[PDB]
mmCIF file of C-alpha atoms in Angstrom:
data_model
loop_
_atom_site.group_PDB
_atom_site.id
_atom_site.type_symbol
_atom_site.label_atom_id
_atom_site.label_comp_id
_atom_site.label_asym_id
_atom_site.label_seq_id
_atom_site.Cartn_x
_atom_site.Cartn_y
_atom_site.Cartn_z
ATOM 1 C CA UNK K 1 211.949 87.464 93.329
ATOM 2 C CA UNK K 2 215.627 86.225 92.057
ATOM 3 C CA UNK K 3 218.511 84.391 93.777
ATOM 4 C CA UNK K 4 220.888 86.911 94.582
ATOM 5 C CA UNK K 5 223.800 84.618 96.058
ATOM 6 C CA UNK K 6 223.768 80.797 97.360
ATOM 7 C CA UNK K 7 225.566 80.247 100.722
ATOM 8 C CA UNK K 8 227.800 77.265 100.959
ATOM 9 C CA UNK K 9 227.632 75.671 104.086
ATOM 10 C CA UNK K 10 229.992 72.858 105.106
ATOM 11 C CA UNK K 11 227.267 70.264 104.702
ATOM 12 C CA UNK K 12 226.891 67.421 101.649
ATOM 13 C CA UNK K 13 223.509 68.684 99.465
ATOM 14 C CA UNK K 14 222.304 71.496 102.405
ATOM 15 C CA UNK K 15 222.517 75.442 101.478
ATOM 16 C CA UNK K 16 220.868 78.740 102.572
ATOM 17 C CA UNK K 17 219.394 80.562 99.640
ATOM 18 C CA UNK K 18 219.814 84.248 100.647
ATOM 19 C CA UNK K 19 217.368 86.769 98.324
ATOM 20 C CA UNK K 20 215.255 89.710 98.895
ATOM 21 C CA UNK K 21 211.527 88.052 98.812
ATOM 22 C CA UNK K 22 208.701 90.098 99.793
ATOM 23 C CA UNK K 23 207.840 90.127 103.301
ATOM 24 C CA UNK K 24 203.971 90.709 102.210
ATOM 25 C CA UNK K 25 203.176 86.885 103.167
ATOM 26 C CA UNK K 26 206.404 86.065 104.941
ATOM 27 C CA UNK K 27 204.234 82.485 106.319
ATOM 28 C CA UNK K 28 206.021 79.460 107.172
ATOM 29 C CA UNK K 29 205.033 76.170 105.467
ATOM 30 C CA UNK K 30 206.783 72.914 104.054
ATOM 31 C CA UNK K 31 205.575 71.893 100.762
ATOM 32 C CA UNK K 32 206.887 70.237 97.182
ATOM 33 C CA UNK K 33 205.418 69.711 93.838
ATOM 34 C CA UNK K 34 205.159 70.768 90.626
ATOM 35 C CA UNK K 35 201.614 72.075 89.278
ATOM 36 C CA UNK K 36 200.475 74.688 87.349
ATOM 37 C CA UNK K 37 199.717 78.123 88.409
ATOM 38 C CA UNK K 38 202.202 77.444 91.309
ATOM 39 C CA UNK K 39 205.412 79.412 91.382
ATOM 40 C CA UNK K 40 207.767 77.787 89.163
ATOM 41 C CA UNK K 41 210.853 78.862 91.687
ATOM 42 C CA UNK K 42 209.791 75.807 93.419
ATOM 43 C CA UNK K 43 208.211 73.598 90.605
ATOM 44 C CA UNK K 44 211.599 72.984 89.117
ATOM 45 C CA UNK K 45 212.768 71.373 91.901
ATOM 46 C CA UNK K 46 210.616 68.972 92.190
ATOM 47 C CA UNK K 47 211.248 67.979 88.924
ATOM 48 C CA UNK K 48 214.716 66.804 90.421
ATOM 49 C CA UNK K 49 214.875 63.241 92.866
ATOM 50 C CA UNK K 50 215.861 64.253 96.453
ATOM 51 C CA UNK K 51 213.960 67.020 97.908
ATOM 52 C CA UNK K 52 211.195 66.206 100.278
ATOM 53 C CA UNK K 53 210.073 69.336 101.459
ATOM 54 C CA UNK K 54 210.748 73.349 101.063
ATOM 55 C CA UNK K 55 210.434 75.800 104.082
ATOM 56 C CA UNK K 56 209.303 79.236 102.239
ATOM 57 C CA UNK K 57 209.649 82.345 105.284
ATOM 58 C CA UNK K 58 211.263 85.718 105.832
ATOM 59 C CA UNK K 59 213.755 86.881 102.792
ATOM 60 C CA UNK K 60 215.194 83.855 102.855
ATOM 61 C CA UNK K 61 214.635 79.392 102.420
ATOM 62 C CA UNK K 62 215.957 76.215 103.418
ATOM 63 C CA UNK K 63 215.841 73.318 100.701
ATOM 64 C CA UNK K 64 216.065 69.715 101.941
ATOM 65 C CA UNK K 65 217.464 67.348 99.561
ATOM 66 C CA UNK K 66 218.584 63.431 100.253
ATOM 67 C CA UNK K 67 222.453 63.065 99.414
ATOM 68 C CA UNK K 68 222.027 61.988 96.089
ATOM 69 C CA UNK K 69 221.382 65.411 95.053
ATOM 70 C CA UNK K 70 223.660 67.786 93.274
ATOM 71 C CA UNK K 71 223.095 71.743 93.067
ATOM 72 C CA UNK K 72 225.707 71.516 90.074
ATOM 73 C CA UNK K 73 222.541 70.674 87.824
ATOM 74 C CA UNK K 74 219.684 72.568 89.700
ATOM 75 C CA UNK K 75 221.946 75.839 89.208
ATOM 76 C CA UNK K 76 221.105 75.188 85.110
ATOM 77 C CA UNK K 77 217.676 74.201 85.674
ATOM 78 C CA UNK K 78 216.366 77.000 88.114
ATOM 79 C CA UNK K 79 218.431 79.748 86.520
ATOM 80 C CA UNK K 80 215.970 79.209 83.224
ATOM 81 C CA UNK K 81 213.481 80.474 85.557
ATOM 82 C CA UNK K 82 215.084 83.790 86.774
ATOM 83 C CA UNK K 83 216.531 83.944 83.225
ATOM 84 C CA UNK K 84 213.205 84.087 81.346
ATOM 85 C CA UNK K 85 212.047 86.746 84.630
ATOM 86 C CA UNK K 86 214.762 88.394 84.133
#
């Protein structure tokens, strides 16, 4: 439902977003784009060059972006989402 924390990894643009999601459809599938109607935790993203795919399952994701990608201005643009929510 909301970020609680990110977890830093030693990589370059790869993180573990840890977050209590519900479990009610805790399926495992790969997709990216922005569209209406579609949850907008994972429309804003696309809106950003350099991920290629999202793996949604259990309480917690996996975002793959290129290495052109910075979290420093996703952390502005996804928090307007949680914000609003919130």
């Amino acid at each position: 439902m909301e970020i609680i924390a990110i977890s830093e990894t030693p990589n370059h643009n790869t993180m573990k977003v840890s977050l209590s999601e519900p479990r009610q459809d805790n399926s495992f599938t790969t997709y990216t784009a922005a569209q209406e109607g579609q949850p907008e935790f994972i429309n804003r993203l696309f809106e950003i060059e350099g991920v290629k795919s999202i793996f949604y399952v259990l309480d917690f994701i996996s975002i793959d972006k290129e290495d052109n990608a910075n979290w420093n201005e996703l952390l502005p643009q996804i928090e307007n989402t949680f914000a609003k929510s919130n």
